[PDB]
Design a protein around this nucleic acid. Sequence first.
DNA 1: GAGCGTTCAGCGTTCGTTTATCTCCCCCTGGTATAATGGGAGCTGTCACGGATGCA
Lengths: 48, 250, 73
Amino acid sequence: AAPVTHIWYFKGVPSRLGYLLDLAPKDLEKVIYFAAYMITFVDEERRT
Amino acid sequence: GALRFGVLGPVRAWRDGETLATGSPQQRALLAALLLREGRTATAGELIDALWGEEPPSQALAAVRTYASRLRKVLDPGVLVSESGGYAVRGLAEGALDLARAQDLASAAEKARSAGDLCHARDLLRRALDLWDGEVLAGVPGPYAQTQRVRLGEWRLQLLETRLDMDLDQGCHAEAVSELTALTAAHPLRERLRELLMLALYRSGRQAEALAVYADTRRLLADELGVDPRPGLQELQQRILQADPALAEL
Amino acid sequence: YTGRGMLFLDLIQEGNLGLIRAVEKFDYTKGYKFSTYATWWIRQAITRAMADQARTIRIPVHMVEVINKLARV
DNA sequence: GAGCGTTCAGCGTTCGTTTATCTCCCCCTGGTATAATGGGAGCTGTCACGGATGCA
């Protein structure tokens, strides 16, 4: 019903997770396990 | 009210001497298939396979249920139990089945032989053979009944061969030749019956007729199978040819 | 009801379903607190789920109530 | 022809069949009305090596 994330590709050595999104592993632990929010998108043009 | 069952001829049942209407051929097939397990439950799969084999009708299971219900109307309540989705016959007294009655007499006869009571052993075998009211499972359709006809028909012949040996051992040669001529006509390929006949003929002094028995048999087995008689028949032939006195002493 | 083949956090979530049931069937016309009404529904949801989800080979709910009854006696 | 001799015949005559009806327990679901309102709990000590990851 709700998507999940592969344990292999994140939560491992940084040659495989890779920082493909510029986020620390502590940052990732907070967002995907429902402890902190992320701003997935901003209407930066609207705001101006 | 004592139920008795007959399977050594047409499938029959009696209650207090009155003959019960065992029904259609398929019901006799079902009853025989249930009687021969001696109280062990037969699953619905085994009963379908017993009646029709590899080609059952698409609604065969409902037919089996119909036959089972009708047996409950003629048999006493509680003998035909419904268990594990199948049926079993329970609560019969010991020896209520003639097959069991025939089997019990045969086991006692072996003990009587081991105890040396050949006269009682002959009588026990005589009482046993009288239970055959013709062809076992006569007129009963289905593949399962077919296997029992051959298996139990052979067993009758095996008991028959043993009785003649005991009769011949007591010197009753002259009576045995008459019955054996009918038996060899019905069972021409059974070499053991011809072995007993030739020995009986010699002890009845009919050596020339005994040798005549060898000549047709040797030709007949050559004609149908191309085979010589077994060594046991050959040695017995030779002992007549050697005029061995040790065959005539009981 | 922890330590019976169901994880402790899993028990909370199933009981949580019982709570949302209870509020739809509760009203002020009865002169009683919500706490007394709720606990019946919480216990119902937890014990039914325990019957329906603990064992690898599923056992029907009425067989389950039979075996724990005979076990206690 | 006498008297009975074999063998189709189609016809009944219900018994043969499989196929159609119809009555019953496991199994699943819903519901209890005093008040009850944030876990137990099991750990711990090998050893070296390296590279990520934190922080003075």
